[PDB]
Amino acid sequence: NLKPVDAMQCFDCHTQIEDMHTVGKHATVNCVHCHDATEHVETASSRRMGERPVTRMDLEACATCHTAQFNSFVE
Amino acid sequence: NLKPVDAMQCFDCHTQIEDMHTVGKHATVNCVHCHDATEHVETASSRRMGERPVTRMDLEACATCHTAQFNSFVEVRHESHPRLEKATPTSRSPMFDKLIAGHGFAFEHAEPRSHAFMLVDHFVVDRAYGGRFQFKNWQKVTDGMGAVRGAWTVLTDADPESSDQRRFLSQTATAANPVCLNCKTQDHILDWAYMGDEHEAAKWSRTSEVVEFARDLNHPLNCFMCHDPHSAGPRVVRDGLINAVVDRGLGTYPHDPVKSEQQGMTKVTFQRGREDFRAIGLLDTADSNVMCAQCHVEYNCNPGYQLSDGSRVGMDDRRANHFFWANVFDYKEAAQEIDFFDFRHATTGAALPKLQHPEAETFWGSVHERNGVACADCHMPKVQLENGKVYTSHSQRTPRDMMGQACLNCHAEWTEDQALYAIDYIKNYTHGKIVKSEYWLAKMIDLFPVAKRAGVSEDVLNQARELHYDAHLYWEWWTAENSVGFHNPDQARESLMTSISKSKEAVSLLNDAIDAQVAV
Amino acid sequence: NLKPVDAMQCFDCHTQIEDMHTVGKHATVNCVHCHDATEHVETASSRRMGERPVTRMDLEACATCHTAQFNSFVEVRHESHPRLEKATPTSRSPMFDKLIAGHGFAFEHAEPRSHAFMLVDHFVVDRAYGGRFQFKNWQKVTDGMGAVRGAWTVLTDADPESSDQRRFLSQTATAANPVCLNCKTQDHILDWAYMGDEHEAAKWSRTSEVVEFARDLNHPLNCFMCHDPHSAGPRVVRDGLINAVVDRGLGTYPHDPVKSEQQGMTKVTFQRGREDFRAIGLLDTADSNVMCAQCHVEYNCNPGYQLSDGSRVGMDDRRANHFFWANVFDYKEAAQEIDFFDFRHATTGAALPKLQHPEAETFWGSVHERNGVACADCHMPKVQLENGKVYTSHSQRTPRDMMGQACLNCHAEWTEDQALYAIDYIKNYTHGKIVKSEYWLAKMIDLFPVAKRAGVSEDVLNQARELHYDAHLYWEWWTAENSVGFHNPDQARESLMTSISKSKEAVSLLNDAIDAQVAV
Amino acid sequence: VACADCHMPKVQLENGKVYTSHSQRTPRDMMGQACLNCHAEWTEDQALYAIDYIKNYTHGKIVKSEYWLAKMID
Numbered sequence A: 001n002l003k004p005v006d007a008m009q010c011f012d013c014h015t016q017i018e019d020m021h022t023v024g025k026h027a028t029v030n031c032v033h034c035h036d037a038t039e040h041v042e043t044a045s046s047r048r049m050g051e052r053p054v055t056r057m058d059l060e061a062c063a064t065c066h067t068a069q070f071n072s073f074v075e
Numbered sequence B, C: 001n002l003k004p005v006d007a008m009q010c011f012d013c014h015t016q017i018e019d020m021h022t023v024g025k026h027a028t029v030n031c032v033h034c035h036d037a038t039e040h041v042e043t044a045s046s047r048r049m050g051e052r053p054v055t056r057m058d059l060e061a062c063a064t065c066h067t068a069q070f071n072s073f074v075e076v077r078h079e080s081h082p083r084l085e086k087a088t089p090t091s092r093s094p095m096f097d098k099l100i101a102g103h104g105f106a107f108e109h110a111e112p113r114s115h116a117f118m119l120v121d122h123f124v125v126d127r128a129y130g131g132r133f134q135f136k137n138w139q140k141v142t143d144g145m146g147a148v149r150g151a152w153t154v155l156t157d158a159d160p161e162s163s164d165q166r167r168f169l170s171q172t173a174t175a176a177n178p179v180c181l182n183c184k185t186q187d188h189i190l191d192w193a194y195m196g197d198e199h200e201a202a203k204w205s206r207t208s209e210v211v212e213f214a215r216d217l218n219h220p221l222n223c224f225m226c227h228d229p230h231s232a233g234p235r236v237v238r239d240g241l242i243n244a245v246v247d248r249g250l251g252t253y254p255h256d257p258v259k260s261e262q263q264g265m266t267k268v269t270f271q272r273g274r275e276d277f278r279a280i281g282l283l284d285t286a287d288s289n290v291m292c293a294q295c296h297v298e299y300n301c302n303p304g305y306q307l308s309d310g311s312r313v314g315m316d317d318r319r320a321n322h323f324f325w326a327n328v329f330d331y332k333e334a335a336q337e338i339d340f341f342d343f344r345h346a347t348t349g350a351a352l353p354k355l356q357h358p359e360a361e362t363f364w365g366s367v368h369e370r371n372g373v374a375c376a377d378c379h380m381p382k383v384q385l386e387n388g389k390v391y392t393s394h395s396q397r398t399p400r401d402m403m404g405q406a407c408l409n410c411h412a413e414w415t416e417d418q419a420l421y422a423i424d425y426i427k428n429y430t431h432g433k434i435v436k437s438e439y440w441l442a443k444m445i446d447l448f449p450v451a452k453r454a455g456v457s458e459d460v461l462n463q464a465r466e467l468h469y470d471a472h473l474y475w476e477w478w479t480a481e482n483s484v485g486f487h488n489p490d491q492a493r494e495s496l497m498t499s500i501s502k503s504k505e506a507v508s509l510l511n512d513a514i515d516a517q518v519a520v
Numbered sequence D: 001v002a003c004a005d006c007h008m009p010k011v012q013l014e015n016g017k018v019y020t021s022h023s024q025r026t027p028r029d030m031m032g033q034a035c036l037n038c039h040a041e042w043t044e045d046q047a048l049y050a051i052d053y054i055k056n057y058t059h060g061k062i063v064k065s066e067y068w069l070a071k072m073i074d
C-alpha cells in the first residue's frame, strides 16, 4: 500500500514543480504515485541530486485513478 | 481546484481515523476530497466538535477516481419493468390484495427496479407518504443519473409548508417512518445514533417526523455503505445488521460457526462527548453476502403489536428497528423471541407477520452458499475484457444479462440456453406452488365471514387464526423473496407445501364448524 | 378507360359542389373518377334527382392517384394480436365477466386490431349478429386487403333467406343496430339522414333491420371520412360528432374556447327535395384530434333506459345516437342531462353506464394536448425518407413501431429505450390501479347476493346500487380507453382511486347491514 | 473541428458521468458521436457514403499518379 511523502519538503528544492502542482487538478495527488525518492531525499541538497530518485513511466501509474481513460486507450 | 489540507493536524485529534487511513489503500487520498473542515479545525477541542465540518455524502465524491465503478453502478436496466404492481395476475402475487388486506402494502407494492432509483421510489410509492411526493413530471421516471445526483432534483413536495404525514390522494397510506431510510440512503450516517435511539448528538431518530427527515436526504445507496472511506476496506454500516451479527452474537453465518469466524465482522464505535454514538462493522473479507444483507433481509422497520397481549409496539421501541436474522423455518420462533407481529388481517382478524425480501436468509444453506458462492458472483461479477484493467461491475442485476461471467464460467458443461432453462425450471415450479398456496389461503379467508355469520364459536375462529399465521408465513416468504425459489429451491418447496397444509387444515376446521351450526 | 364528363353541366345544378370543387386541390379531378351520372343528367331537374347516379365508395377510387396513402392504410400490423378477448387474466380486464354481467359485451369483447378489419370484425364478433356472419374460412382472418375490397368478398351469412336478428350459436348476442355502422363504414353516406332520423330520402335509419343494412355495406373507414372528395380539404362526416360540436355548441375543444375558435368546424348541409338531409363538418385545419374523434369517443349507439323512471329508450329515440363529448369527471352529469343509462347489472341490479373507447375525451387537458400535439403526431406521422417526396403514413398504430418519427423527434434527450420505459411506467402503474379497482368492485358485487339473502333492506341495497354506478364509471372508463393511462395519466389515477373509494364505501355499507341482520 | 472530435469523442451515456474516449480510431465505429451530432441532416449510411465518395475519388488519382510515375521510371 502506498504511503504518502511530505510534498512540502520536496518543494523546498523543487519550486518549479511546486508552482505547477499546487495550482492544478493534481494538487492532492501525492508524489509517491509516480516517484520513489526516499534515498534521494536522504542524500540531496538543493545543489546536488544525491541518489537519483525513480520516476514511473508506466501507464498503470495513471490507470489507478483514471481506469475509464486507460481501458478505452488499450482497446 | 482542491487544495490538500494537513492530515497530521486532523490526526492529532482523530486517532481512530489515523489508524484506519494511514494503513489502507486510501493513505494517499487527502481529507479535502470529502470534508470541508477549516472552521472545525479553528474551533474544535480534543473532546468538543466546535464548528461542524462539512462531509460529502454524494456518490460523485468517489466517481472522480473510480469512474468505471460509478458508471456501472448508475446504469438503468430498462428491461427491469418500472412501477409494476405485484398484486396482478401477470406478476408475483395474483391474490395479494385478499391475502394482505389490513396491511399498508395493499395500497401499492411494485417489483424492484435499478438501485439508482431506490430513494426516489421510496418517496413516491403510494403506501409511503400519502402521495405527498411525486416526480416533477412523468418523464423524470427515466432519470437514474438525476436521482443519484439527488432525490430533490427530480421530485416535488405537494405541501412544503407542513410536515405531517397525511393522505394527499384517497388510495394512499403513510407507512413511511425514519427506519425505512436506513435501507435507501446513508446520507444521515453522522446524524443518526446506532439503532435510531434518542441521543443528544443525533438530529434524527426512530421517533422523528419522517417528512422532515425525508427532506434532508438525497442520495441512494452511497458507495461508503460497503467500503470504508478511510481505509477503503470492506464494511457494513447498517445498525440492524451489526446488532444481529455482533450484539446478539449470531455471527455472519448463523448456521456455520466456522465460516462466521473466517468471514466475520468487527464492530467499531464512534463517540460524541465521550459517549457511544454510531458504529460500523469492518469485514474480515470483501464478502458480498454480508454487504447485500444490509438491505436484502427480512426486518422490522415499523410499529406493530405484541403476540402475548395485543398491545401496540411503537417507533420508540427498539423492536421497530430489528433484523430477525432467521430463515423461514426459524422465523416464527424469532418473532416469538421479541413478542411481535405486524398486523391483523382485515377479514380473518388473525395476528399476522409481514415478510420482506429475505434473500440473505434464504440463500443460507443453499448449494451455492455451501460452496462459497456469494451474491456478487451472480449479480455483480468481474468485467471480462480482451485488453484492459479488470474491475468489478457495480450494476447489480439479474445474471441473465451476463451469463458468461455470472454462470457459464463455473458451469462449463452448459450453454447459455441450458443454464437459462435450469433457472426457469425452478422458477416455474416454485411459482406454481406460490399460486396454489394463494388459492388455499384465499379459500380459507373466504370462509371466515361465512363462519362468523353462521355463529361459529370464537374458540374455533381463534384456532383458525392460529393456522392463518403459519399458512401466511410459509407462503409470503416466497412472494417477498425475489428469486422465485432460485436461491433455495428445496426450501421454497418444503415451505410452500407447509403453507398449503396449514390452509387445508383451516378450511376443514371451518367447513366442519359451519356445517355443524347449520345442522343445529 | 375513363372518359371525362363535362363538369360545367353538373355545376349548372350543383352549386354547392361547384363552390367546393373549383377552389380546392381536386379542381382538376374529373367527376367520372367517382360518379357514373349519364342517365342522371338526362332525367334530373333542378330540384328532382331523376335517375340516381352511381357513386363509388370503395377506397381504390382514391388509390389510383394516392397509392402511397392507400398502401400505408391497408397494412396489417400482425403484432396487434387478433381476436384477443379482454376478459382474461393476461388482457385488459381480468374480472370483466363479473363486472359487466347483464351487458352484451360479456359475450365477447376483443382488443382492437388494424383498421382494415373494422367492418368485418364488427360483423363477426359474437356479441353482434348472433353468430350469423363468419369469415368464409379461418384463413381469411389474415386478408386485410380482401376486407378493404369488400366485407362480402371474405364473409358468409348463415341464412341469406331471413333478415331477423337471432342467435345461430348459443353464446352469442344480437347487440348490433344501424347506429354501430356509422363508426365502421360510410358506404351509406347518401342513404342515411343526419342522426339516422326517419326521412323520405333515406333508405336506412336508426330503426332499420340491421341485418338488411349490413348486407348493403362493404368498405371499412372510407378515405372520404376525413377528406372532402370535392375540395380535398379536411372534414368529418360523423353525425354524432357534428351534433355535439355544432348543434349543441360545445365546440371542438370544449375546455378551450380559444382553440375551439382557431380549430373549429363549419356544418354544411345537403338537401333532398329542398329539405335538410345530410351534413358534413369542414375543419378549419387538418386537425386529427377531431378526425379520429369521429369514432374514438364514448357514445350511445344502442337502446337503454331512463335514470328517472327506468323506462325503455329505443332505437327510435335520438338518444340512441349520441356523443356525450364529456371527460370522465363530467360524464355522470352528461348522462343525467339526457336521462339515460345502459343496463342493469345482473347480480347487483344497479343501473349502470356502459363506457366505450373514450380516447378523444381522455386526451383533452393532457400535457400533450395542451401543447398542441394531436393523435396523428403519435399514431400516423410523416414518413422520413433519405431521398423522396414526404407523405403522411396512414397506418394508424402504436408509436412503438416508429419511435424516431412519433416521439424521439420531439424528445431529443431520450433514446428509444428510455422513451419506451417512460410509456411502460405509466401503463404499469395504471394497470395496477385498474386491477385493484376490479378487485374492490368484485368484492362489492359478491356481497349483494349475501345481503339480499340475509334480508338486508331495499333502502340499503339501493344506496349500494347508487355507489355501484360511480364505482363502475370510474373504473370502466380505463379498461375501455386503449392507452392504459398514457393519454392522461393523472386523470386515470384520480379516477381509479375514486372507483376504489366508492367500492370500499359500498362494501362497508353492505357488511355492516349483513352483520346487523345476523345479530337480529 | 479538431482530430479528437472525429477520432476520440466524448462518450454518450443514458445515465453516467461523461468522459473522453481514448480509443483513437476511425469515426466509422462511433458515427453517432463523431459525425452525426454535427450533421443532423444525414443518416449514418449517408455520412459513410460521403466519406467513400472522397476516398474512392482520391484513391483513383493516387493509382493514376503511380501509373505515370511507373511509366517515367521504366
Ligand code: HEC
Residues within 6 Å of the ligand: A007, A010, A011, A014, A017, A021, A026, A029, A030, A031, A032, A033, A034, A035, A055, A056, A057, A061
Ligand atoms: C504521476 C501522476 C506524477 C505525480 C503525482 C508527480 N510526478 Fe513528478 N514527474 C512525473 C513524470 C512522468 C515525470 C517525467 C517528466 C514529465 O514532464 O513528464 C516527472 C518529473 C519530475 C521532476 C523532474 C522535472 C525535471 O527537472 O525534468 C521532478 C523534480 C518531479 N517530477 C517532482 C515531483 C514532486 C516533488 C511531486 C509531488 C508534489 C511529483 N513530482 C508528483 C510524474 C509524477
Ligand code: HEC
Residues within 6 Å of the ligand: A025, A026, A029, A030, A033, A061, A062, A063, A064, A065, A066, B028, B064, B065
Ligand atoms: C489518483 C491518486 C490520481 C492519479 C494517480 C492520477 N490522477 Fe489525474 N486526476 C485526479 C483527480 C482527483 C483529478 C481532478 C478530477 C476533477 O475533475 O476534479 C484529476 C484530473 C486529471 C485530468 C483533468 C485535468 C484538467 O485540467 O481538466 C487529466 C488530464 C488527468 N488527471 C491525467 C492524469 C495522468 C495522465 C496521470 C498519470 C500520470 C494521472 N492523471 C494520475 C487523480 C489522479
Ligand code: HEC
Residues within 6 Å of the ligand: A064, A065, B025, B026, B029, B030, B033, B061, B062, B063, B064, B065, B066, B223, B224, B227, B229, B231, B232, B233
Ligand atoms: C482519488 C483522489 C480517490 C478518491 C476521491 C477515492 N478513492 Fe478509492 N482508491 C484510490 C486509490 C489510488 C486506490 C488504490 C488503487 C490500488 O489498487 O492500489 C483506491 C482504492 C479503493 C478501493 C480498493 C480498496 C481495496 O482493495 O482494499 C475501494 C473499494 C475504494 N477505493 C473505494 C472508494 C470509495 C467508496 C470512495 C468514495 C467514498 C473513494 N474510493 C474515493 C483513489 C481514490
Ligand code: HEC
Residues within 6 Å of the ligand: B077, B080, B111, B112, B113, B114, B115, B116, B117, B118, B119, B121, B122, B182, B183, B184, B185, B221, B225, B288, B291, B292, B293, B294, B295, B296, B375, B376, B379, B380, B396, B397, B398
Ligand atoms: C440497501 C441500501 C440496499 C443494499 C446494500 C443493496 N440493495 Fe439491492 N436493492 C435495494 C432496493 C431498495 C432495491 C429496489 C430499488 C427500486 O427503486 O425499486 C434494490 C434492487 C436490487 C435488484 C433488482 C434490480 C433490477 O434490475 O430490478 C437486484 C438484483 C439487487 N438489488 C441486488 C443487490 C445485490 C446483489 C446487493 C449486494 C451487492 C444489493 N442489492 C445491495 C436495496 C439495497
Ligand code: HEC
Residues within 6 Å of the ligand: B108, B109, B110, B111, B112, B113, B121, B122, B123, B125, B127, B128, B175, B176, B177, B179, B180, B181, B182, B183, B294, B295, B296, B297, B298, B299, B300, B301, B302, B356, B357, B480, B482
Ligand atoms: C432494509 C432492511 C429495508 C428497510 C428497513 C426498508 N426497505 Fe424498502 N426495500 C428494500 C430492498 C432490499 C428492496 C428491493 C427488493 C424488493 O423486494 O422490493 C426494497 C424496495 C422498496 C420499494 C420498491 C418496491 C416496492 O415495494 O414498491 C419501495 C417503494 C420501498 N422499498 C419502500 C420502503 C418503505 C416505505 C419502508 C419503510 C416502511 C422500507 N422500504 C423499508 C430494503 C428495505
Ligand code: HEC
Residues within 6 Å of the ligand: B059, B062, B063, B066, B069, B070, B073, B221, B222, B223, B224, B225, B226, B227, B286, B287, B288, B291, B292, B376, B390, B391, B392, B393, B394
Ligand atoms: C455493496 C452493496 C457495495 C456498494 C454500495 C459499492 N460497492 Fe464497490 N465493491 C463491492 C464489491 C463486492 C466489490 C468487489 C470486492 C472483491 O474483491 O470481490 C467492490 C469493489 C470496488 C473497487 C475495487 C476495484 C474493483 O474491483 O472494481 C472499487 C474502487 C469500488 N468497489 C468502488 C465503488 C464506488 C465508487 C461505489 C459507489 C458508486 C461502490 N464501490 C459501491 C461492493 C459495493
Ligand code: HEC
Residues within 6 Å of the ligand: B080, B112, B288, B289, B292, B293, B296, B359, B360, B363, B368, B373, B374, B375, B376, B377, B378, B379, B397, B398, B399, B400, B423, B427, B482, B483, B486, B487
Ligand atoms: C447465483 C448462484 C446466484 C447467487 C449466489 C445469488 N443469486 Fe440472486 N438470483 C439468481 C438468479 C438466477 C435469479 C433469477 C433472475 C432471473 O432473471 O430469473 C436471482 C434473482 C435475484 C433478485 C431479483 C432479480 C431480478 O429478477 O431482477 C434479487 C434482488 C437477488 N437475486 C438478490 C441476491 C442477493 C442479495 C444474494 C446474496 C444473498 C443473491 N441474490 C445470491 C442468482 C444468484
Ligand code: HEC
Residues within 6 Å of the ligand: C025, C026, C029, C030, C033, C061, C062, C063, C064, C065, C066, C223, C224, C227, C229, C231, C232, C233
Ligand atoms: C387523380 C385523378 C386523383 C383522384 C382519383 C383523387 N385525387 Fe386527391 N389529389 C389529387 C391531386 C392532383 C392533388 C393535389 C396534389 C398537390 O399537392 O397539389 C390531390 C390532393 C389531395 C389531398 C391534399 C389536399 C390538401 O392538402 O388540401 C387529399 C387529402 C386528397 N387528395 C385525398 C383524396 C381522396 C380521399 C380521394 C378519394 C375519394 C382522392 N384524393 C382522389 C389527385 C387525385
Ligand code: HEC
Residues within 6 Å of the ligand: C077, C080, C111, C112, C113, C114, C115, C116, C117, C118, C119, C121, C122, C182, C183, C184, C185, C221, C225, C288, C291, C292, C293, C294, C295, C296, C375, C376, C379, C380, C396, C397, C398
Ligand atoms: C371510425 C370510422 C374510426 C375512425 C375515424 C378511426 N378509427 Fe381507429 N379504430 C376503429 C375501429 C373500429 C378499430 C378496431 C378495428 C378492428 O377491426 O378491431 C380501430 C383501431 C385503432 C387502433 C388499433 C390498431 C392496432 O394495431 O391494433 C389505433 C392505434 C387506432 N384505431 C387509431 C386511430 C387514429 C390515430 C385515428 C385518427 C387518425 C383513428 N383511429 C380513426 C375506428 C376508427
Ligand code: HEC
Residues within 6 Å of the ligand: C108, C109, C110, C111, C112, C113, C121, C122, C123, C125, C127, C128, C175, C176, C177, C179, C180, C181, C182, C183, C294, C295, C296, C297, C298, C299, C300, C301, C302, C356, C357, C480, C482
Ligand atoms: C363510434 C362512436 C363507434 C360506434 C357507434 C361503435 N363502435 Fe365499435 N369500435 C369503435 C372504435 C374506435 C373501436 C376500436 C377501439 C376499441 O376499444 O375497440 C371499435 C371496435 C369494435 C370491435 C373490435 C373490438 C371488440 O370490441 O371486439 C367490434 C367487434 C366493434 N367495435 C363492434 C361494434 C358494435 C356491435 C357496435 C354497435 C353496438 C359498435 N361497435 C359501435 C367505434 C365505434
Ligand code: HEC
Residues within 6 Å of the ligand: C059, C062, C063, C066, C069, C070, C073, C221, C222, C223, C224, C225, C226, C227, C286, C287, C288, C291, C292, C376, C390, C391, C392, C393, C394
Ligand atoms: C382520418 C381518420 C383520415 C382517413 C380515413 C384518411 N386520411 Fe388521409 N390524411 C389524414 C391526416 C391527418 C393527414 C395529414 C394532414 C396534415 O396536414 O398533417 C392526411 C393526409 C392525406 C394526403 C396529403 C398528402 C400527405 O400528407 O400524405 C392524401 C393524398 C391523403 N391523406 C389521402 C388519403 C387516402 C387515399 C385515404 C384512404 C386510404 C386517406 N387519406 C384516409 C387523415 C385521414
Ligand code: HEC
Residues within 6 Å of the ligand: C080, C112, C288, C289, C292, C293, C296, C359, C360, C363, C368, C373, C374, C375, C376, C377, C378, C379, C397, C398, C399, C400, C423, C427, C482, C483, C486, C487
Ligand atoms: C403521443 C404524445 C400520443 C398522442 C398525441 C396520442 N396517443 Fe394514442 N397512444 C400513445 C401511446 C404511447 C400508447 C400506448 C401504445 C403502446 O404500444 O403501449 C397509445 C395508445 C393508443 C391506442 C391503443 C394502441 C395499441 O396499443 O395498439 C389507441 C386506439 C390510441 N392511442 C388512439 C389515440 C387517439 C384517437 C388520439 C387522439 C385523440 C391519441 N391516441 C393521441 C401515444 C399518443
Ligand code: HEC
Residues within 6 Å of the ligand: D001, D002, D003, D004, D005, D006, D007, D025, D026, D027, D028, D051, D055
Ligand atoms: C472529422 C471531421 C475528422 C477530423 C477532424 C480528423 N479526421 Fe482523421 N479521419 C477521418 C475520416 C472520415 C477518416 C477515414 C476513416 C475511414 O474509416 O474511412 C480519417 C482517417 C484517419 C486516419 C486513418 C484511420 C483509419 O482508417 O483507421 C488517421 C491516422 C487519422 N485520420 C488521424 C487524424 C489526425 C491526427 C487528425 C487531426 C490532425 C485527424 N485525423 C482529423 C475524419 C477526421
Ligand code: HEC
Residues within 6 Å of the ligand: A059, A062, A063, A066, A069, A070, A073, D004, D018, D019, D020, D021, D022
Ligand atoms: C494525446 C494524444 C493524449 C494521450 C496520450 C492521453 N490523453 Fe487523456 N485526453 C486527451 C484529450 C484530447 C482529452 C479531452 C480534452 C478535452 O477537454 O476535450 C483528454 C482527457 C483526459 C481526462 C479528463 C476527463 C475526460 O475528459 O475523460 C483524463 C482523466 C485523461 N484524459 C486521462 C488519460 C490517461 C489516464 C491517459 C493514458 C492512458 C491519457 N489520458 C492519454 C488526450 C490524450
Ligand SMILES: O=N[O-]
Residues within 6 Å of the ligand: B164, B165, B208, B209, B210, B211
Ligand atoms: O408520522 N409522523 O412521522
Ligand SMILES: O=N[O-]
Residues within 6 Å of the ligand: C164, C165, C208, C209, C210, C211
Ligand atoms: O333487430 N332488428 O334489427
